[PDB]
């Protein structure tokens, strides 16, 4: 009886909090006529601050979430989203946008807290069902937010400034709603070290761990800079012409459908893993190279298709990795295993972005940067293919 109230309220809160209309249109807004911002300043100054701040903030945020009750951190995440949008709306110089990226890193940092919170509150026996409902609700919210924003701008022909104002009310409502949710009762050691040592010896785990470390950072870099590349391809003379949100919605739908597929044959494809990684990485590298090589104004639709295909391809691979990693370990150690992996991936991403894009260095523009990322992904694919071939060589004997 009373259980249903919280069961629906958690899903409602998640769905409402994923309603960010202007998130996908932030990059065009920065380059819009109303703001005297150059593309090179955006590409060389802002996102490096995002990456560095993410690396700086990750570990303390997770440790605070685990030590403290989750509800404070969830409220902090909502408040951080509010602050990010306020700074974006009132940003007046490059330093303001740098601070905005600093705050947005915090919001990005606490996304994983939600799953742990839901796991803590719900009874262990009923955890699976409620977790599935929550994942469905949050994915639906993410899918509908971009659709709502893009449809509002496209046919409504509303200006960009209006869109962010509309988004602000939704963010305020999200934080207000989040404030109410009840805090978990009680979710607060050589055994952990022994378990980590024992599990680490497993062969299957290391491959996926390295994949998560490197390919994840590459994918995140591509995701960050793709919007700037799109703006470079075509000027946004008219607000309606842009369809950034539509690509995000399509990518969300494709990722959902393909992730559904992974579970269908996750076990049946366990034996063949290196070859699968090589094949997927090859397609990702080809798509990145295609994005880099497209310069004609009228091919923009094909660029959108390549991007949605790339994001879908990356999304397809995640569930298999999560399943393979989780099986050996236990719930207690899973969060630590994921956290360490995430931290190493962020360190790698920080190094790469500081080298390629950060000032006081190469500082290459977006085009050559994507051209370099293409070679990076191709090298990863070649390494995986060579490893698979070496493994197969012994199998014959």
From Swiss-Prot:
UniProt keyword Cell division, yes or no: no
Substitution effect: residue 315 to A = Reduces methotrexate uptake. Reduces IRF3 phosphorylation upon cGAMP stimulation
Identify the coding gene: SLC19A1
Instruction: Give residue spans on the Extracellular membrane side.
Output: 29-42, 91-94, 157-161, 231-242, 293-298, 361-368
The molecule here is called: Reduced folate transporter
**Impact upon substituting residue 219 to A:** Reduces methotrexate uptake
This chain's source organism reads: Homo sapiens (Human)
Q: What is the effect of changing residue 108 to T?
A: Reduces methotrexate uptake
Q: What part of the entire protein does this chain span?
A: 23 to 459 of 591
Reported impact of residue 111 to A: Reduces methotrexate uptake. Reduces IRF3 phosphorylation upon cGAMP stimulation
């Amino acid at each position: 009886r009373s259980w249903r109230h919280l069961v629906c309220y958690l899903c409602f809160y998640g769905f409402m909090a994923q309603i960010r209309p202007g998130e996908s249109f932030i990059t065009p807004y920065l380059l819009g006529p109303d703001k005297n911002f150059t593309r090179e300043q955006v590409t060389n100054e802002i996102t490096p601050v995002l990456s560095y701040s993410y690396l700086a903030v990750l570990v303390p945020v997770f440790l605070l979430t685990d030590y403290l009750r989750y509800t404070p951190v969830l409220l902090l995440q909502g408040l951080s989203f509010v602050s990010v949008w306020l700074l974006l709306l009132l940003g007046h110089s490059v330093a303001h946008m740098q601070l905005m990226e600093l705050f947005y890193s915090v919001t990005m940092a606490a996304r994983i807290a939600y799953s742990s919170y839901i796991f803590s509150l719900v009874r262990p026996a009923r955890y699976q069902r409620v977790a599935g409902y929550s994942r469905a609700a949050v994915l639906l919210g993410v899918f509908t937010s971009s659709v709502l924003g893009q449809l509002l701008v496209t046919v409504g022909r509303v200006s960009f400034s209006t869109l962010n104002y509309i988004s602000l009310a939704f963010l305020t409502f999200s934080v207000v709603l989040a404030l109410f949710l009840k805090r978990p009762k009680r979710s607060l050691l050589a055994r952990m070290l022994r378990e980590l040592g024992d599990s680490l010896r497993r062969p299957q785990l290391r491959l996926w761990s390295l994949w998560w470390v490197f390919n994840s950072a590459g994918y995140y870099l591509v995701v960050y800079y793709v919007h700037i590349l799109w703006n470079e391809v075509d000027p946004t003379t008219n607000s309606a012409r842009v369809y950034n949100g539509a690509a995000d919605a399509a990518s969300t739908l494709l990722g959902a459908i393909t992730s559904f597929a992974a579970g269908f044959v996750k076990i049946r494809w366990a034996r063949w893993s290196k070859l699968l990684i090589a094949g997927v990485t090859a397609t990702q590298a080809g798509l990145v190279f295609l994005l880099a090589h497209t310069r004609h104004p009228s091919s923009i639709w094909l660029c959108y298709a390549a991007f949605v295909l790339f994001r879908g391809s990356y999304q397809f691979l995640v569930p298999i990795a999560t399943f393979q990693i989780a099986s050996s370990l236990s719930k207690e150690l899973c969060a630590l295993v994921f956290g360490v992996n995430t931290f190493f991936a962020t360190i790698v991403k920080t190094i790469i972005t500081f080298i390629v894009s950060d000032v006081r260095g190469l500082g290459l523009p977006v085009r050559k940067q994507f051209q370099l990322y293409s070679v990076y992904f191709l090298i990863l694919s070649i390494i995986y293919f060579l490893g698979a071939m070496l493994d197969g060589l012994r199998h014959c004997q």
